[PDB]
Amino acid sequence: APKAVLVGLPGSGKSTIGRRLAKALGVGLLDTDVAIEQRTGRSIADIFATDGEQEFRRIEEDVVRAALADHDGVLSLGGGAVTSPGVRAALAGHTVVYLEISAAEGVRRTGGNTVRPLLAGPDRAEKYRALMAKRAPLYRRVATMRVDTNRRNPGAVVRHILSRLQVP
Ligand SMILES: O=C(O)C1=C[C@@H](OP(=O)(O)O)[C@@H](O)[C@H](O)C1
């Protein structure tokens, strides 16, 4: 089972925090998006575009559930995984770190050329705010630790996480 599971919007720092946490803990990082691509032989973009979000979510839930059983390192979940009830259920009992980010900073961090089916222009900020509004209670419901990634540089967020993982 993972030492920690990271959840949060695109742009919250899952990749960067997950790599730095994994290194600090002496374990590997598993990103469920990557796992999906590996198990399907398909890009995430392709799954959304051809088969649709609903089929993606069932796929994702399967992979997340497997990863929670089988991965012993740091697990990073795709931003929308917590929209699946079965994901939220499977997270019960785990250490779950919610990376919280303002809409302004999250938007800024997602404005590159990564393909993001649910966060494309135009009006990407409106889309980001709508994802944040919808998913915030869901992140909160599953989280065991909540961490602000706003401004705070990554090194310091990781330090804060390790500290909170360790003490009562
Ligand atoms: O927000 C979402 O619903 C999604 C987030 C992505 O994960 P990251 O947060 O790792 O980019 C990926 O699973 C897919 O594009 C759907």
At residue 148, the 3 state secondary structure works out as strand
Nearest ligand 1 atom to alpha carbon 119: 1
Residues belonging to the binding site are 11-16, 33, 57, 79, 116, 135, 152
At residue 8, the 3 state secondary structure works out as coil
Residues belonging to the binding site for substrate are 33, 57, 79, 135
Pocket mutation for ligand 1, best pick of 33, 36, 59 (most atoms within 8 Å of C-beta): 33
Amino acid at 168: P
Pocket mutation for ligand 1, best pick of 55, 58, 118 (most atoms within 8 Å of C-beta): 118
- Cα(167) to centroid of ligand 1, in Å? 31
59: nearest Cα among 72, 70, 48: 48
Give the CA distances from residue 140 to residues 43, 99, 101, 146, in Å, rounded to whole numbers and listed in that order.
29, 10, 13, 8
CA atoms of 93 and 127, how far apart (whole Å): 31
Q: Which residues line ligand 1 (CB under 6 A)?
A: 10, 14, 33, 44, 78-80, 116-118
Give the CA distances from residue 40 to residues 1, 36, 106, 135, in Å, rounded to whole numbers and listed in that order.
23, 6, 29, 26
Nearest ligand 1 atom to alpha carbon 14: 10
Residue 123, CA atoms < 13 Å, CB-side half-sphere? 6
Q: Which helix (H) or strand (E) holds 3?
A: none
CA atoms of 62 and 69, how far apart (whole Å): 11
Longest dimension (CA), the chain: 47
CA atoms of 155 and 161, how far apart (whole Å): 10
Give the CA distances from residue 101 to residues 14, 24, 128, 150, in Å, rounded to whole numbers and listed in that order.
11, 22, 11, 5
Q: Which helix (H) or strand (E) holds 13?
A: none
Residue 64 near residue 81 (C-beta atoms within 8 A):
yes
- The burial of 9, by beta-carbon neighbours within 10 Å (0-12 exposed, 13-18 middle, 19 or more buried), is given as buried
CA atoms of 146 and 157, how far apart (whole Å): 11
CA atoms of 28 and 80, how far apart (whole Å): 22
Listing DSSP states for 63-103 in one string gives HHHHHHHH--SEEE--TTGGGSHHHHHHHTTS-EEEEE--H
Tokens 């790599």 belong to which residue?
Answer: 19
Nearest ligand 1 atom to alpha carbon 8: 9
CA atoms of 80 and 89, how far apart (whole Å): 15
The CATH code belonging to domain 1-165 is 3.40.50.300
81: nearest Cα among 3, 148, 9: 9
Method: X-ray
